[PDB]
Design an enzyme around this catalytic site. Structure first.
Site, PDB file in Angstrom:
ATOM      1  CD  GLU A  70      -2.988  -1.011   0.060  1.00  0.00           C
ATOM      2  OE1 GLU A  70      -3.319   0.114  -0.365  1.00  0.00           O
ATOM      3  OE2 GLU A  70      -3.426  -2.052  -0.443  1.00  0.00           O
ATOM      4  CD  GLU A  92      -5.322   8.006  -3.116  1.00  0.00           C
ATOM      5  OE1 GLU A  92      -6.037   7.825  -2.102  1.00  0.00           O
ATOM      6  OE2 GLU A  92      -5.714   7.766  -4.269  1.00  0.00           O
TER       7      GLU A  92
END
Ligand SMILES: [Cl-]
Ligand SMILES: [Cl-]
Ligand SMILES: [Cl-]
Ligand SMILES: [Cl-]
Ligand SMILES: [Cl-]
Ligand SMILES: [Cl-]
Ligand SMILES: [Cl-]
Ligand SMILES: [Cl-]
Ligand SMILES: [Cl-]
Ligand SMILES: [Cl-]
Ligand SMILES: [Cl-]
Ligand SMILES: [Cl-]
Length: 247
Positions: A70, A92
């Site tokens: 991730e 992100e």
């Protein structure tokens, strides 16, 4: 000291696994710390404390395998291999989408706040920040950015995700600790217990059933490395190319 994982994972091991996260080439240098991980884990006693010694280590390896992917900064031919580049990002890259599902009623989106991925599990959406905040006793809906400014909170969000079933999906914890009993429908979908179902829980709609083989293999590559380091069997059903995504 029950719930303290420092007896089964050392700093030496933690920073060997994550040997590039503090490199100048990464983007969250010094953010994720061993102390922050150990503190977060104390809030979820059963995490890393379920089963015999080998099961406890397997769960840690699985958690780091998935969260390393991730957060990866790896590339083909990266120093020491792409499977050494976990934890290179803490949030992100694309921050333009608020990730607000206004059709959910229990977890209202706060004005001007964004629920893009943050932390080791890249927790996203008002409908995750909401219940996570409730469970941790934090105002994450109103202040989601604390999940990328406080490393203890960042790890807590990731362990919370790992420990929390979200129907129809079981928890990652339950799968890795041999506590999930697949329904007949799960069996028909090819979802046999293992690391593969865990990938399916996290992002199966976009990666499993052959939808993104490269991403799935990256998740596997970290997990197998970490299992080898702890000296534990990774188990069966490690891939999800023949599983249908959860509905
Ligand atoms: Cl240590
Ligand atoms: Cl630096
Ligand atoms: Cl717990
Ligand atoms: Cl406790
Ligand atoms: Cl234990
Ligand atoms: Cl990636
Ligand atoms: Cl990079
Ligand atoms: Cl590589
Ligand atoms: Cl980042
Ligand atoms: Cl925000
Ligand atoms: Cl099986
Ligand atoms: Cl990837």
């Amino acid at each position: 000291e029950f719930g303290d994982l420092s007896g089964i994972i050392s700093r030496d091991q933690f920073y060997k696994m994550l040997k590039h996260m503090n490199d100048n080439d990464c983007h969250a240098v010094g953010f994720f710390t061993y102390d922050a991980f150990i503190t977060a884990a104390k809030s979820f006693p059963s995490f890393g404390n379920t089963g015999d010694l080998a099961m406890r280590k397997k769960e840690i390896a699985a958690f780091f395998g998935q969260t390393s992917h991730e957060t990866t900064g790896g590339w083909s031919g990266a120093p020491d291999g792409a499977n050494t580049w976990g934890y290179c990002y803490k949030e992100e890259i694309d921050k333009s989408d608020p990730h607000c599902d206004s059709n959910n009623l229990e977890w209202p989106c706060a004005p001007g706040k964004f629920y893009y991925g943050r932390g080791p599990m890249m927790l996203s959406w008002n409908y995750n920040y909401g219940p996570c905040g409730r469970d941790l006793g934090l105002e994450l809906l109103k202040n989601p950015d604390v999940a990328s400014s406080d490393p203890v909170i960042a790890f807590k969000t990731a362990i919370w995700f790992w420990m929390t079933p979200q129907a129809p999906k079981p928890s990652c914890h339950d799968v890795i600790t041999d506590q999930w009993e697949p329904s007949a429908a799960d069996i028909s979908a090819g979802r046999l217990p293992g690391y593969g179902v865990i990938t399916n829980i996290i992002n199966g709609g976009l990666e499993c059933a052959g939808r993104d083989v490269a991403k799935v293999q990256d998740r596997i590559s970290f997990y197998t490395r970490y299992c080898g380091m702890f000296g534990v069997d990774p188990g069966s059903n490690i891939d999800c190319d023949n599983q249908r995504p959860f509905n």
